[PDB]
């Protein structure tokens, strides 16, 4: 069986959400491949299927949905509600075979024709990340929408919107202490707002940051990476600035020795 991490938006405080994200990170990496104080997610190639996925159980009103997160990139691939399961379109064959292992005891399995990346989901949702709100409200409503998709109520522009909400508040909060902290400040003051460009460019730059950090000359980037702040305005040439920012990376190369 796969590991399960529990969370509910009913009474969610900065403490409970924080401990939830930290448990998610704990199950994403063993901690055995840390480079520059940043853990590297395990390599996809040699990974047995029995270690490929993580399960996140969300609850609220008390409807529960189980998201499936890919261990190799902390990203959501599908979800389970009741006796139904819905998956994102795989981009090769081995991940599809791995998907068949996720929710084996459900009656109905349906794979969306579209992938899980931000582009396609944005196009389905009618909005893009820059205008969709994040917060405990958006998450609590997202859980209900996901549950009632299998019931037959929710439509696609709402389903995919709830998808990008869950992905940002869970997957990207796990990837970055920065985004986790911003969600903590939204939960603390009951706020609900669109993620400012700092968040969005960090989301778009996760893979490139992984590559540059693992490929650096003892921390020094070979090429500078461009990021943004909150107003939208910089280059990073080193891993030092990113240590309290990024919490998880993809396996790009082998450790140098």
């Amino acid at each position, epitope marked *: 069986q796969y590991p399960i991490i529990n969370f509910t938006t009913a009474g969610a405080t900065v403490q409970s959400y924080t401990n939830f994200i*930290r448990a998610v*990170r*704990g199950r994403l990496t*063993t*901690g*055995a491949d*840390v*480079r*520059h*104080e*940043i*853990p590297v997610l395990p390599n996809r190639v040699g990974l047995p299927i029995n270690q490929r996925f993580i399960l996140v159980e969300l609850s609220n009103h008390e409807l529960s949905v189980t998201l499936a997160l890919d261990v190799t990139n902390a990203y959501v691939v599908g979800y389970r509600a009741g006796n139904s399961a819905y998956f994102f379109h795989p981009d090769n064959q081995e991940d599809a075979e791995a998907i068949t292992h996720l929710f084996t005891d459900v009656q109905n399995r349906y794979t969306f024709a579209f992938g899980g990346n931000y582009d396609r989901l944005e196009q389905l949702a009618g909005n893009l990340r820059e205008n969709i709100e994040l917060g405990n409200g958006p998450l609590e409503e997202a859980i209900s929408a996901l549950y009632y998709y299998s019931t037959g109520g929710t439509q696609l522009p709402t389903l995919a919107r709830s998808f990008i909400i869950c992905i940002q508040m869970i997957s990207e909060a796990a990837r970055f*202490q920065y985004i986790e902290g911003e969600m903590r400040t939204r939960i603390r003051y009951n706020r609900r707002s669109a993620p400012d460009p700092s968040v969005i460019t960090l989301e778009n730059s996760w893979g490139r940051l992984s590559t540059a950090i693992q490929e650096s000359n003892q921390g020094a980037f070979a090429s500078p990476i461009q990021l943004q702040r909150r107003n939208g305005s910089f280059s990073v040439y080193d891993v*030092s600035i990113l*240590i*309290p920012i990024i*919490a998880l990376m993809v396996y790009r190369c082998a*450790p140098p020795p």
Partner: nanobody
Amino acid sequence: VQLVETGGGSVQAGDSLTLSCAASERIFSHYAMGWYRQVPGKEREPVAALRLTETNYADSVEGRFTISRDNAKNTMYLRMSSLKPEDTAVYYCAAGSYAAILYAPSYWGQGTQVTVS
């Protein structure tokens, strides 16, 4: 991949001890490190932490404990001054990520007994 400790023992209240932790080369350049402690029957609590450089001390030990590092010898140190009976525990050297050194570390040493009576 290895964390070796030494420096425990039995002292009286008000005395001091200094723990040392020889670390592997890979751990030393890519990991945050720290010191935890545990009494039989209770949970492991973090005591000190060296990150980024950045220090993090538990409220119980701030002002009395000082964590330090020697880059040229692959050894981390914890100086424990003005010891109290509350400090009696098994102390563990630890190494983890930047975020998860203050909670849920990655690597551990054997654990050295510190007795304050």
